[PDB]
């Protein structure tokens, strides 16, 4: 007769030490020692561990595993053990009370079945928990506004100076031509940003100079975000207005310095590892406008309070969509810093242009001067 068990076994040993495994533990197969060690390591992280004085070349086996705990845990990470596979305290409470108080142990009593002689499940509110309605409404509104304000820039395409292909390499007016072109594209960008922020809810609740200061401060960074969104990974080029593509050397022919051009491309290629959608981009921009640390802000309290809902809305959207990647959110909030650095670099580019007595459009000259 055949044994009634799935039984997947046969001593495949251990990915950490290489002792005999009892099965898979925390997304990998290992023994009791490694399992218990990993558990007590996750539940208690403040425990005293000895630093590794023998170098990261520590060899793991069924013996030396007790020597260096840091290397043991590091190879537990190398084994692919996830931290989220360890049940938390609020998670474990529901895995106890259900199995103790009534169900499956010591107690079964109901209306049917009863040998009683001598011994609404589904929803309260129409719930389903996180990501409430208003948040998704705001997100969809931001996306729709982004597209709607993006379509207005599509009719400005043959309003601009043509690109001088096959141009004299030593020609100054060629570089001036490309520069003028890019500045015009920047004008279109700025108007687009203004319209977008205009369609942003809560933004109309501020003062004139408040909105103006916020816009003038966040403009360049929003441009950096939109540019990083229009960046093409494989071809390593950036496509503006969807029909105009430019490479790095095209920016080199524009007359822009290497220290301005390079970090922007670093920033653009760094954001593709995040894999952000239009919603996350829109939320990032929305938060970026509402940064209260901007200069010339009379009421930073209103701005911060306005920044509050967009932050948490971005959180609920991130956690629900990709629960597997928990670092996406802090890595997203950290891009603002890079936007600040690149903003400084941008200002230095502006001063660079001022050094050669170059002229920029009245709008761009209004914002960045």
């Amino acid at each position: 007769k055949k044994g009634p068990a799935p039984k997947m076994l046969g001593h495949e040993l251990c990915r950490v030490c290489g002792d005999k495994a009892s099965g898979f533990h925390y997304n990998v197969l290992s023994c009791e020692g490694c399992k218990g060690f990993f558990r007590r390591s996750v539940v208690r992280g403040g425990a005293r561990r000895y630093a590794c004085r023998g170098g990261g070349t520590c060899q793991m086996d069924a013996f030396m595993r007790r020597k260096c705990q840091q290397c043991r845990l590091r190879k537990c990470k190398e084994a692919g053990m996830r931290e989220q596979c360890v049940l938390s305290e609020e998670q474990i409470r529901k895995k106890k009370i259900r199995k103790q108080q009534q169900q499956e142990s010591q107690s079964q009593s109901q209306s049917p079945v009863g040998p009683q002689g001598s011994s609404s499940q589904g929803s309260g509110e129409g719930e389903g928990v996180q990501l409430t309605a208003a948040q998704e409404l705001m997100i969809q509104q931001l996306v729709a506004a982004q597209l709607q304000c993006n379509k207005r820039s599509f009719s400005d395409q043959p309003k601009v100076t043509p690109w001088p292909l096959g141009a004299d390499p030593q020609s100054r007016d060629a570089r001036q031509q490309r520069f003028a072109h890019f500045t015009e594209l920047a004008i279109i960008s700025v108007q687009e940003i203004v319209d977008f922020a205009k369609q942003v809810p809560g933004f109309l609740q501020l003062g004139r100079e408040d909105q103006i200061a916020l816009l003038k401060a966040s403009t360049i960074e929003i441009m950096l975000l939109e540019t990083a969104r229009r960046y093409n990974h494989e071809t390593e080029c950036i496509t503006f207005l969807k029909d105009f593509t430019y490479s790095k050397d095209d920016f080199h022919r524009a007359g822009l310095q290497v220290e301005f051009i390079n970090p922007i491309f670093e920033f653009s290629r760094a954001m593709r590892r995040l894999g952000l959608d239009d919603a996350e981009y829109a939320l990032l921009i929305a938060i970026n406008i509402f940064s209260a640390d901007r200069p010339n802000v009379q009421e930073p309290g209103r701005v911060e309070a306005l920044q509050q809902p967009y932050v948490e809305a971005l959180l609920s959207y991130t956690r629900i969509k990709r629960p597997q990647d928990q670092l996406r959110f802090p890595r997203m909030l950290m891009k603002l810093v890079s936007l600040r650095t690149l903003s400084s670099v941008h200002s230095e580019q502006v001063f660079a242009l001022r050094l050669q007595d170059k002229k920029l459009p009245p709008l761009l000259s209004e914002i960045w001067d």
Binding site: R152, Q191, V194, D195, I212, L215, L363, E366, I367
Partner: peptide, 12 residues
Amino acid sequence: HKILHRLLQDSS
């Protein structure tokens, strides 16, 4: 401060 302001009140 003028041109951004005139870009604000209405559609561009």
